[PDB]
Design a protein around this ligand. Structure first.
Ligand SMILES: [Cl-]
Ligand SMILES: [Cl-]
Ligand SMILES: [Mg+2]
Ligand SMILES: [Mg+2]
Ligand SMILES: [Mg+2]
Ligand SMILES: [Mg+2]
Ligand SMILES: [Mg+2]
Lengths: 107, 108
RNA sequence: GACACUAAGUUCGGCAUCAAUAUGGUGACCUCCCGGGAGCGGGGGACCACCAGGUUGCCUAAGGAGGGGUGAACCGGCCCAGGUCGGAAACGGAGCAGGUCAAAACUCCCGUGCUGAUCAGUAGUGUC
């Protein structure tokens, strides 16, 4: 029941039809499922990385380009896990904003 | 053939079953040849070509075509949901196979 | 009869052929939402290109919304085997090869404007 977050969703180098889900203004260079998980897990979000899954609209097969990330929004009872994270859009955006800060990118 | 069956047909079929053992034993010294576990390797190699075009297929030097214009390798890889290395691999075996065929005949 | 001039006939060549609009399409791209565990399902705006037949500018000597072709390894659009990806599945997606095309692009032939040359020597008029 967790939700799905594919890097294509947060890629500013992709068009709409190519899988982008957020405005280019907020999108990111080349987000990696890893980075996505690393910023989500570090906010109190329950999430696990599906390293080998591949996004259907992703012609490339390389690594930097594949993997999937799963985050728990609601809890079995119904309450959101983190009030500040209603929707999926909420997480996508939060991620798009925090990755360009990861030390590994400011390097 | 016409959705029917002539003696020449029966002949050609028996003939196909002939150039077997031979062609098969010609795969002898070629690292890239477990009967079922081979068929896949053979069906894969074929599907990859299911993505090449006539001009590429019918080329005296396919290896180069692809060598010189790498985009073709990428086009093929992606077009047959296989990896890029896979394609280059298929390309080298075809070379080895070519060179082999050279030392002997070709049609047989 | 012999010459001229206007109208004009034949043929092989040359040069050249707008603009701005509504309605409906196709495509591309962006931007907002709802639903959903994925592939997605659903709905609102914006921009650009092109097409179908339809106007008008007050537009040029002409400028028709004509008819083909090619479509490129990929790099236009469709349909997409296989394989690939998501899916337990049902299916769905990206998509090469292959096929295809009112609607990427590029090109011919039409027509239409001037225009050399050619051939005819008829139609009229005029001259000696
Ligand atoms: Cl969306
Ligand atoms: Cl690429
Ligand atoms: Mg005159
Ligand atoms: Mg073609
Ligand atoms: Mg093509
Ligand atoms: Mg299929
Ligand atoms: Mg599709």
């Amino acid at each position: 029941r967790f939700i799905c977050i594919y890097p294509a969703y947060l890629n500013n180098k992709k068009t709409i039809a190519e899988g982008r889900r957020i405005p280019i203004s907020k999108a990111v260079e080349n987000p990696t499922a890893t980075e996505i998980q690393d910023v989500c897990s570090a906010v109190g979000l329950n999430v696990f990385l599906e390293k080998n899954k591949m996004y259907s609209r992703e012609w490339n097969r390389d690594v930097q380009y594949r993997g999937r990330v799963r985050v728990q929004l609601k809890q079995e009872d119904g309450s959101l896990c983190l009030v500040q994270f209603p929707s999926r859009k909420s997480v996508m955006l939060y991620a798009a904003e925090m990755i360009p800060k990861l030390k590994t990118r400011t390097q | 053939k016409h959705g029917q069956f002539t003696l020449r047909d029966m002949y050609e079929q028996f003939q196909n079953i002939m150039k077997m053992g031979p062609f098969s034993q010609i795969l002898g010294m070629i690292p890239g040849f477990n009967e079922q576990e081979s068929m896949a390797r053979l069906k894969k190699l074929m599907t990859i070509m299911d993505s090449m075009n006539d001009q590429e297929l019918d080329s005296t030097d396919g290896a180069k075509v692809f060598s010189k214009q790498p985009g073709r390798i990428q086009r093929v890889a992606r077009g047959s949901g296989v990896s890029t290395r896979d394609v280059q691999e298929l390309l080298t075996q075809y070379t080895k196979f070519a060179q082999m065929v050279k030392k002997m005949g070709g049609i047989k």
